[PDB]
Amino acid sequence: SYELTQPLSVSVALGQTARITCGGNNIGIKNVHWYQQRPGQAPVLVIYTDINRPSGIPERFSGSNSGNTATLIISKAQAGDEADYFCQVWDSNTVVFGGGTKLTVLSQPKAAPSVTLFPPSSEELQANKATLVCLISDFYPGAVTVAWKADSSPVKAGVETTTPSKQSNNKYAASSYLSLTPEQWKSHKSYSCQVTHEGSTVEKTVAPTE
Amino acid sequence: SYELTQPLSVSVALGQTARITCGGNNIGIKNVHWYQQRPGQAPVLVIYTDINRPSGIPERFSGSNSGNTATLIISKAQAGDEADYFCQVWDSNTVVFGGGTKLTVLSQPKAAPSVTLFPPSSEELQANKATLVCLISDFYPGAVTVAWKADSSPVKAGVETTTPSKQSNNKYAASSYLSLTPEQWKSHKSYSCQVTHEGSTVEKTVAPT
Amino acid sequence: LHLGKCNIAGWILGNPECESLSTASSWSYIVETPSSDNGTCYPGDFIDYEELREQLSSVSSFERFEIFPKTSSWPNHDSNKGVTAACPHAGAKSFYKNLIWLVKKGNSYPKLSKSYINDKGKEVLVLWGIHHPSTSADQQSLYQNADTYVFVGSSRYSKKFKPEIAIRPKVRDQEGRMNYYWTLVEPGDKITFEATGNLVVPRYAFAMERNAGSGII
Amino acid sequence: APLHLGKCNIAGWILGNPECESLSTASSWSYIVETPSSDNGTCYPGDFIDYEELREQLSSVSSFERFEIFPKTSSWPNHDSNKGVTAACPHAGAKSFYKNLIWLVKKGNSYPKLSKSYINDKGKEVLVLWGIHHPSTSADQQSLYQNADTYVFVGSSRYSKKFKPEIAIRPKVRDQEGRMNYYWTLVEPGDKITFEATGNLVVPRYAFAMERNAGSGII
Amino acid sequence: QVTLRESGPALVKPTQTLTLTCTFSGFSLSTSGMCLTWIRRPPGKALEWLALIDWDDNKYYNTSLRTRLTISKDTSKNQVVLKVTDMDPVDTGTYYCARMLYGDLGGRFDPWGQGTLVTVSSASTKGPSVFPLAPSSKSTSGGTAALGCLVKDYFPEPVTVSWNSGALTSGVHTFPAVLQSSGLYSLSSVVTVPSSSLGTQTYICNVNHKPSNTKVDKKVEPKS
Amino acid sequence: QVTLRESGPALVKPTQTLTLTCTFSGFSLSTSGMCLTWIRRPPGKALEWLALIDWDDNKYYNTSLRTRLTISKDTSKNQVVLKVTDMDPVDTGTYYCARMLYGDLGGRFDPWGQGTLVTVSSASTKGPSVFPLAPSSKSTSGGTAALGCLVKDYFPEPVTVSWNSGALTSGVHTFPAVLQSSGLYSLSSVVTVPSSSLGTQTYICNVNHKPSNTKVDKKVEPKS
Ligand SMILES: *[C@@H]1O[C@H](CO)[C@@H](O[C@@H]2O[C@H](CO)[C@@H](O[C@H]3O[C@H](CO)[C@@H](O)[C@H](O)[C@@H]3O)[C@H](O)[C@H]2NC(C)=O)[C@H](O)[C@H]1NC(C)=O
Ligand SMILES: *[C@@H]1O[C@H](CO)[C@@H](O[C@@H]2O[C@H](CO)[C@@H](O)[C@H](O)[C@H]2NC(C)=O)[C@H](O)[C@H]1NC(C)=O
Ligand SMILES: *[C@@H]1O[C@H](CO)[C@@H](O)[C@H](O)[C@H]1NC(C)=O
């Protein structure tokens, strides 16, 4: 019935004030609540009935509501404020959510990824399997490319790489896997994982023996 | 204003049920209160808001209210119930009293009067005055007649007789005074007060001594 | 059923105009008038009216019974005085048929304590009220005690009531108020009333068996 | 001419119903004209106690001045005076409240015991008004005033009453299932009025020092 | 226990102002629903309401007599005052002070004071001459004797008579006064006492005519 | 404190019935204004409300999905159960349990449960294979060394990974899983530990794949 409307995304620079608008006909005379959902976490109530702030919510969170538009206001935007923000009301004795707004904080500083490469475990080799693990963490922005090398040859199939995800420290982490046969892993002199991030290259290499 | 209407008098036989009405336009939705005023005493609330009975009021007092008529019911009517009864409402920021109703209890038993008569005190004689006090009490009904006598001559000068009034035992008391000069008092052989009540006569006589 | 010019509250409480009716035993919905003249004759606010509106929307078995007989349930109090001008019936003061306005008996309003166990094999609807007098004079005149309380308690309900003495705006020649509450008593449960005044006790209850869904028209 | 209000009644005028102007206050008047049962009066649902008596006390007045008895910014440092807004009292589309009352809410997770007092130094009787909020559910009681079993007490030389709020779902009126009762009193000069509450109190922001006259009513 | 008392039987000249003071106890006027009222009853005449004051200092009046009535409560102590301007002889009667209980229950009066007699006349006051009535055992009595006091020629009413400063009440009968042709009042009060108590006990009648501020203690003893 | 716990990550086949159970504490569902609500979030879509139960046992449902939802309060055990029949692949997502506070404030959710992952698929459940990642020091800043665990080839999500039965959280980094081309999932968890502890302190990664009811404790010891 009642239709709440939000923008699909909002962007702000570090330290600036973010404003997320919730649209609705005569919404000012209705109790609007705001919820935040950080990447892969449970939602949290940041603002209830328009302007109220629960305990523990930082004071840079505020709200307003008049006419046809309610607003969530985040002053001094921090890297940890990036999340999805939803507005919700009670109309006709029903719950009504908004489409949600994706808040991206611009101007964040870049961070170089730390790369760790593990060779196939001796226990896995006994299972007639072999998996190379390339763990990449602590980088921003979340855009990296990964290349695998056999000696100095490119490795095509058997490569599984994740999309980067936000860490607790607001940086990104990624993982790439290379599945080999135990005979392939013992056949080549070395294997390498190449991680390119923002025009910088980090390559790590492992070799087989006890 | 708002009109409350009661009958002037209501009479009931002894031991029967009396009903005093209080008329008012749509008075059934109004809060009526009844007050009893026995002769010589202050009013007392006997029934408030239509039906309720305060403490100490005897159980024979009851009340009803409906339509255009409020009513005060006194079952087993007793002689002590002879009084004036007033209905009252608080309406439009104004008290409103009814005209009142004198309730009489018919068929009350008769009582013979006790007649006490005092001669003029020595001190009043010294004041060149002399008065005879004839005291009549404990009789019913209220009607009595008093006749004074000098020796045997029936006097008619200097006599003041009260109107009999209800005393606390629901009977009547009265008094009569004969004003004389000291010379008149000592002149005659005696003086008599003669009270007639319900065909019977009591006579008492004092003498200058 | 269809209840003419009465509302749910006045019908379940039993307003003098809605009147003691034979009524049916089962219904699926209820037809009300948008605005009804005879609701709550004494001024007040019916608590959880919307909750009770939906519980009574669809009923398969409905039987009213005298939970607390007017004659013998209240020996220590006065059960034959609780009438008001706000609830008139044919030119005279009256009251709800299912509720009794208990008043003191002489110069004493002893502590009230009455209980009822649900032996009807189905949930029973009980309703009562707390009178908030207009002035301290009415508090002393009605219930003698100045500082009173009401406690209604079952295994599924528990609340204490503290009446407030105040002069509300005059409505139907009343400056006091009277709220009305209600609870359902599961079979086997025991509802218990405990008060020292201001209690409008129940006279008639309603053993019922509800159904799912339905509303009001 | 005396007073005149128009769209509002005395209740909406004395309380500060945001739809009636609160500042068109003539210093004196002999009688009052208004619409008694008005659209804009007590916007949040409830009952105005002793309302008919207050009308007579305000019918004929020789001197009438309003003043901030409890400054909003400084009188309540341990409570929240900026969150007290409701949809039942709307203004320019947003929610609002009475201009002369402040709906106090807990500050964080605490509603410490409130105790505020004022001494009458205006040289005349001061009209003081305050409200008592009755939430609809115990969840509202914990969200607004934190504490569960609260009480309000207002004391003076000429008045004394303790308020126990009742938490109950009253029928939805102006989008509110809770109620709020409004009270008032007159403080003689030199007398001290005291407020003592652990919740549910709608504190006064503006009082009215006044000098009354004899007679008059309402038209 | 509630107590309502009026302020002295009065004699008021025509066109003068009557002032009645009601002192009360057992309850407070500031209590919600408490009022104090003056209600008079003239000879003949139904009950007539005058003025009322409630717990909030509001004042209501007999609208037919509004211009003459003024009711107020003493800021000090529990007292109420009623002022009635230019009194007429028709304003003669008993004036009662009564508490009125107000509520949605109706507006009723309980309790009532004992009432005070107000007499509007130009005749001026006159103290009473008190003569003893020597004890007697002839009319009525048994082992008892009857002594009394003659209260003669006073105006206006009433006079209050007691015996032994109120220590003697059993067997006392004060008769209603007679209005003599002179326009004055006269009454008699008697008491039946054991005939063996004459000589062994002193009997004093206490007459008090407050309008003249005359109070007499007449010693009644047997004439030897 | 107030607590809401959802009941176990579930793999449901298409057209089967999902049954979720929320357990709560720190408050009573019978207190006025207390409700319990099921809210889900499909991947790539906003929060969608499912059902609600209030202190008066009244039940409210997403009108669009009313025919499939069934909410109830299990008596005695402080548990509300959600039944969703005809589960389809679009019903995949995280299902949250949230207390809703109702009053004149306007009905809001606080707190939320941490959510349970519900997967609707016809595929077969597969427990993971766990391989130790022996410690190396090529990328650890101090004496510290990096040892880990490879949780490979399981379906569906999720798995939990702890170290030393939870007695080790400092320096632990569990990377999100990879959806392999085979349709299965794989993830790794590493922990940076001091080098001196190597050989003298046992490090055991604890893997638990609830959907397959499989739990593997893997001791990661250094290469020798
Ligand atoms: C307000 O005070 C009034 C007196 O100033 C009083 O008026 C009295 O009312 C009666 C009628 O009830 C008047 O007249 C009646 O005279 C004989 C008397 O028995 C009746 O039979 C007649 O019907 C006639 O109506 C009195 O004369 C009058 N009292 C006076 C003049 O002293 C009002 O009753 C008072 N109002 C209230 C509410 O008490
Ligand atoms: C009730 O459930 C339905 C799904 O059956 C929801 O409807 C869709 O909700 C998503 C948001 O996750 C929207 O992107 C779609 O456009 C909705 N489709 C339709 C046809 O409405 C619905 O939102 C749920 N109700 C609430 C209050 O969330
Ligand atoms: C004033 O009245 C209007 C209708 O005339 C109503 O919509 C509004 O809510 C009222 N506001 C207040 C503050 O009373």
PDB file of N, CA, C and O in Angstrom, chain A residues 28-55:
ATOM      1  N   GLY A  28       5.841  13.166   6.617  1.00  0.00           N
ATOM      2  CA  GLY A  28       6.204  13.916   7.807  1.00  0.00           C
ATOM      3  C   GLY A  28       5.324  13.600   9.004  1.00  0.00           C
ATOM      4  O   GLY A  28       5.725  13.818  10.152  1.00  0.00           O
ATOM      5  N   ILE A  29       4.117  13.101   8.759  1.00  0.00           N
ATOM      6  CA  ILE A  29       3.169  12.818   9.827  1.00  0.00           C
ATOM      7  C   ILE A  29       3.219  11.325  10.126  1.00  0.00           C
ATOM      8  O   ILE A  29       2.289  10.761  10.717  1.00  0.00           O
ATOM      9  N   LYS A  30       4.305  10.675   9.714  1.00  0.00           N
ATOM     10  CA  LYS A  30       4.486   9.250   9.927  1.00  0.00           C
ATOM     11  C   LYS A  30       5.845   8.994  10.562  1.00  0.00           C
ATOM     12  O   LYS A  30       6.818   9.699  10.284  1.00  0.00           O
ATOM     13  N   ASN A  31       5.894   7.979  11.421  1.00  0.00           N
ATOM     14  CA  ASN A  31       7.094   7.645  12.177  1.00  0.00           C
ATOM     15  C   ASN A  31       8.039   6.844  11.289  1.00  0.00           C
ATOM     16  O   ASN A  31       7.763   5.687  10.955  1.00  0.00           O
ATOM     17  N   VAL A  32       9.156   7.457  10.914  1.00  0.00           N
ATOM     18  CA  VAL A  32      10.149   6.839  10.045  1.00  0.00           C
ATOM     19  C   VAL A  32      11.304   6.337  10.900  1.00  0.00           C
ATOM     20  O   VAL A  32      11.783   7.047  11.792  1.00  0.00           O
ATOM     21  N   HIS A  33      11.750   5.112  10.630  1.00  0.00           N
ATOM     22  CA  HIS A  33      12.897   4.522  11.301  1.00  0.00           C
ATOM     23  C   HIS A  33      13.968   4.203  10.269  1.00  0.00           C
ATOM     24  O   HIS A  33      13.663   3.837   9.132  1.00  0.00           O
ATOM     25  N   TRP A  34      15.227   4.344  10.669  1.00  0.00           N
ATOM     26  CA  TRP A  34      16.359   4.110   9.783  1.00  0.00           C
ATOM     27  C   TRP A  34      17.195   2.958  10.316  1.00  0.00           C
ATOM     28  O   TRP A  34      17.492   2.904  11.514  1.00  0.00           O
ATOM     29  N   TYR A  35      17.569   2.042   9.427  1.00  0.00           N
ATOM     30  CA  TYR A  35      18.382   0.884   9.769  1.00  0.00           C
ATOM     31  C   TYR A  35      19.623   0.852   8.891  1.00  0.00           C
ATOM     32  O   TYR A  35      19.556   1.155   7.697  1.00  0.00           O
ATOM     33  N   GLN A  36      20.752   0.483   9.489  1.00  0.00           N
ATOM     34  CA  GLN A  36      22.019   0.345   8.785  1.00  0.00           C
ATOM     35  C   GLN A  36      22.404  -1.125   8.716  1.00  0.00           C
ATOM     36  O   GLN A  36      22.242  -1.863   9.693  1.00  0.00           O
ATOM     37  N   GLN A  37      22.912  -1.553   7.561  1.00  0.00           N
ATOM     38  CA  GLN A  37      23.360  -2.931   7.368  1.00  0.00           C
ATOM     39  C   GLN A  37      24.730  -2.913   6.696  1.00  0.00           C
ATOM     40  O   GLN A  37      24.829  -2.777   5.473  1.00  0.00           O
ATOM     41  N   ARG A  38      25.779  -3.063   7.501  1.00  0.00           N
ATOM     42  CA  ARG A  38      27.132  -3.119   6.981  1.00  0.00           C
ATOM     43  C   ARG A  38      27.353  -4.424   6.216  1.00  0.00           C
ATOM     44  O   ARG A  38      26.585  -5.378   6.367  1.00  0.00           O
ATOM     45  N   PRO A  39      28.393  -4.479   5.357  1.00  0.00           N
ATOM     46  CA  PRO A  39      28.620  -5.677   4.534  1.00  0.00           C
ATOM     47  C   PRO A  39      28.610  -6.991   5.305  1.00  0.00           C
ATOM     48  O   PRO A  39      29.511  -7.266   6.102  1.00  0.00           O
ATOM     49  N   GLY A  40      27.584  -7.804   5.067  1.00  0.00           N
ATOM     50  CA  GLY A  40      27.516  -9.128   5.659  1.00  0.00           C
ATOM     51  C   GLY A  40      27.208  -9.156   7.139  1.00  0.00           C
ATOM     52  O   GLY A  40      27.587 -10.110   7.824  1.00  0.00           O
ATOM     53  N   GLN A  41      26.528  -8.139   7.654  1.00  0.00           N
ATOM     54  CA  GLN A  41      26.171  -8.072   9.062  1.00  0.00           C
ATOM     55  C   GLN A  41      24.661  -7.948   9.213  1.00  0.00           C
ATOM     56  O   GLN A  41      23.932  -7.680   8.255  1.00  0.00           O
ATOM     57  N   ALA A  42      24.199  -8.146  10.443  1.00  0.00           N
ATOM     58  CA  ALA A  42      22.794  -7.945  10.747  1.00  0.00           C
ATOM     59  C   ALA A  42      22.481  -6.451  10.790  1.00  0.00           C
ATOM     60  O   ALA A  42      23.337  -5.640  11.152  1.00  0.00           O
ATOM     61  N   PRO A  43      21.267  -6.059  10.408  1.00  0.00           N
ATOM     62  CA  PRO A  43      20.907  -4.638  10.458  1.00  0.00           C
ATOM     63  C   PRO A  43      20.881  -4.123  11.889  1.00  0.00           C
ATOM     64  O   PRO A  43      20.728  -4.878  12.851  1.00  0.00           O
ATOM     65  N   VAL A  44      21.045  -2.809  12.021  1.00  0.00           N
ATOM     66  CA  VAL A  44      21.001  -2.138  13.316  1.00  0.00           C
ATOM     67  C   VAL A  44      20.168  -0.872  13.181  1.00  0.00           C
ATOM     68  O   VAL A  44      20.252  -0.161  12.174  1.00  0.00           O
ATOM     69  N   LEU A  45      19.357  -0.596  14.198  1.00  0.00           N
ATOM     70  CA  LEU A  45      18.562   0.624  14.234  1.00  0.00           C
ATOM     71  C   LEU A  45      19.462   1.795  14.609  1.00  0.00           C
ATOM     72  O   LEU A  45      20.021   1.825  15.711  1.00  0.00           O
ATOM     73  N   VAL A  46      19.609   2.757  13.699  1.00  0.00           N
ATOM     74  CA  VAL A  46      20.472   3.906  13.948  1.00  0.00           C
ATOM     75  C   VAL A  46      19.627   5.113  14.332  1.00  0.00           C
ATOM     76  O   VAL A  46      20.080   5.984  15.084  1.00  0.00           O
ATOM     77  N   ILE A  47      18.400   5.173  13.821  1.00  0.00           N
ATOM     78  CA  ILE A  47      17.473   6.267  14.101  1.00  0.00           C
ATOM     79  C   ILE A  47      16.063   5.697  14.139  1.00  0.00           C
ATOM     80  O   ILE A  47      15.618   5.068  13.174  1.00  0.00           O
ATOM     81  N   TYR A  48      15.357   5.916  15.246  1.00  0.00           N
ATOM     82  CA  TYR A  48      13.965   5.514  15.366  1.00  0.00           C
ATOM     83  C   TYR A  48      13.084   6.747  15.519  1.00  0.00           C
ATOM     84  O   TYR A  48      13.526   7.795  16.001  1.00  0.00           O
ATOM     85  N   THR A  49      11.817   6.582  15.127  1.00  0.00           N
ATOM     86  CA  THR A  49      10.845   7.654  14.905  1.00  0.00           C
ATOM     87  C   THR A  49      11.509   8.984  14.545  1.00  0.00           C
ATOM     88  O   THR A  49      11.587   9.891  15.382  1.00  0.00           O
ATOM     89  N   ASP A  50      12.023   9.066  13.318  1.00  0.00           N
ATOM     90  CA  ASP A  50      12.427  10.311  12.663  1.00  0.00           C
ATOM     91  C   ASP A  50      13.773  10.864  13.135  1.00  0.00           C
ATOM     92  O   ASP A  50      14.703  10.977  12.336  1.00  0.00           O
ATOM     93  N   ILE A  51      13.896  11.211  14.419  1.00  0.00           N
ATOM     94  CA  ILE A  51      15.024  12.004  14.896  1.00  0.00           C
ATOM     95  C   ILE A  51      15.716  11.407  16.112  1.00  0.00           C
ATOM     96  O   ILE A  51      16.652  12.010  16.622  1.00  0.00           O
ATOM     97  N   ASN A  52      15.287  10.246  16.610  1.00  0.00           N
ATOM     98  CA  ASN A  52      15.810   9.732  17.872  1.00  0.00           C
ATOM     99  C   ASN A  52      16.986   8.787  17.657  1.00  0.00           C
ATOM    100  O   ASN A  52      16.997   7.990  16.710  1.00  0.00           O
ATOM    101  N   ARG A  53      17.960   8.866  18.562  1.00  0.00           N
ATOM    102  CA  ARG A  53      19.206   8.120  18.453  1.00  0.00           C
ATOM    103  C   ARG A  53      19.312   7.114  19.588  1.00  0.00           C
ATOM    104  O   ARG A  53      19.314   7.515  20.762  1.00  0.00           O
ATOM    105  N   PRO A  54      19.390   5.815  19.300  1.00  0.00           N
ATOM    106  CA  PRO A  54      19.558   4.824  20.370  1.00  0.00           C
ATOM    107  C   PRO A  54      20.933   4.930  21.013  1.00  0.00           C
ATOM    108  O   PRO A  54      21.823   5.647  20.552  1.00  0.00           O
ATOM    109  N   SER A  55      21.096   4.184  22.102  1.00  0.00           N
ATOM    110  CA  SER A  55      22.365   4.171  22.814  1.00  0.00           C
ATOM    111  C   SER A  55      23.441   3.494  21.977  1.00  0.00           C
ATOM    112  O   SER A  55      23.183   2.509  21.279  1.00  0.00           O
TER     113      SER A  55
END
